[PDB]
Design a protein around this ligand. Sequence first.
Ligand SMILES: COc1ccc(C(=O)n2ncnc2N)cc1
Ligand SMILES: COc1ccc(C(=O)n2ncnc2N)cc1
Lengths: 237, 237
Amino acid sequence: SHMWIGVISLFPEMFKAITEFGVTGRAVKHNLLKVECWNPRDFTFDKHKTVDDRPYGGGPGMLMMVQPLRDAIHTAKAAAGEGAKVIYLSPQGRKLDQGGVTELAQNQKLILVCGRYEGIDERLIQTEIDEEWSIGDYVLTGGELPAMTLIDAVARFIPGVLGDGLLDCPHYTRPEVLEGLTVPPVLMSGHHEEIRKWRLKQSLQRTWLRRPELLEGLALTDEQRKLLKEAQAEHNS
Amino acid sequence: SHMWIGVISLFPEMFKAITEFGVTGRAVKHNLLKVECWNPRDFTFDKHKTVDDRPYGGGPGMLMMVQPLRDAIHTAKAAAGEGAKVIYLSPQGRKLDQGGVTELAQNQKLILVCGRYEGIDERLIQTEIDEEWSIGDYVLTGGELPAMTLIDAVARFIPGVLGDGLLDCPHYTRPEVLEGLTVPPVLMSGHHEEIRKWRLKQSLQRTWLRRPELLEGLALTDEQRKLLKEAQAEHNS
Ligand SMILES: COc1ccc(C(=O)n2ncnc2N)cc1
Ligand SMILES: COc1ccc(C(=O)n2ncnc2N)cc1
């Protein structure tokens, strides 16, 4: 009924974007979702609060310094108590999709470690991280946007937060005519079953035209096979 | 040398997460990146500033109301002047990867439209949007985190913002021994060519073990073929 997410980040104020606004902001205010951040800079001891360090072997960039990051992670783990899964966000991780969101959402506690600079020491991944997850095959400046993405996606599964393999159907609202384009008459018919079938058929058609590989992974129902065949025949004029 | 990004969002304060922090915050402060937000709520005229509307055909949710959203988009387009590409973020869009980031980054101006609720009227996509892009196959509560993700990814290509198909290699920094785990000696050798080859070989090995489909899409160099063959022979003990 409740999810707790610990976050380790050099920029914890970024997480206001999900804790103060919208559906996820409401979830936090209503105690359905709790997001708690620890900043490695607070675990430094030198006068200039150093949180990066030079990579062995040379190279352009810097890495996160091990001692402050490690101490922040340990503090988060102590706060979480038993049973928290520790996740490092990176492009080398398991690719996130909705199946994986649904899996992650089964956890009552997560700790999310956000890398900065060129990333974190490999031995910390070995000794502190349970799983690595990627939000997609593109490179970002840090792990915070992937962590927020993951939080937002799992939050949708917490009961009370909100009020099947296919792409969504098109949606229409007022006015009935917009730049000469009319709303499909079936949607104004009030025929609930025709509307259901139209929506399903559109989703099948859109998945086939835009993401046909997604169909290969589905066991279509008899009704879905029929509506898809119909959509494909109509497309073939 | 400069990128301008117009944003249409009901929660423009979320974009502080990228405009006030880190590498992207520095890019904004130094005028390399400009992010400008318009909020549909500011284009409403009724007393309670309504920005949602009921979907034709029924259904659980709401859609963004057309008139305020449309007016916000028109205002952003007027601000952009000629040549801005207008992007709607959604799971029905083209899947973002680094090739697509590099393509988007060729644009001097982008306008990013962030959906909320169940999304936006299909006729607005037809009449106002140039391209739809997805950051991945998972469902979020709105388009803002995908828009920020996209901004962060393209920002890395603006000259001055920062100081090949494979996953990254492991990275190490101090201490030389951490929980009994030592830094690989090659990285402490100072032999720049051995270090280069070790890194490349690790990237090839990691891509093969974690994401083998990514290799099928590459024309490996002779050196890469060799190091991959070596890594695969060592794995086969
Ligand atoms: C410097 O630390 C990091 C930089 C980038 C990413 C990143 O890009 N991720 N993470 C998950 N999925 C993606 N794409 C992660 C960490
Ligand atoms: C209600 O409006 C929206 C809800 C979700 C998304 C979304 O999830 N996106 N967008 C790009 N890539 C992904 N995954 C977009 C709009």
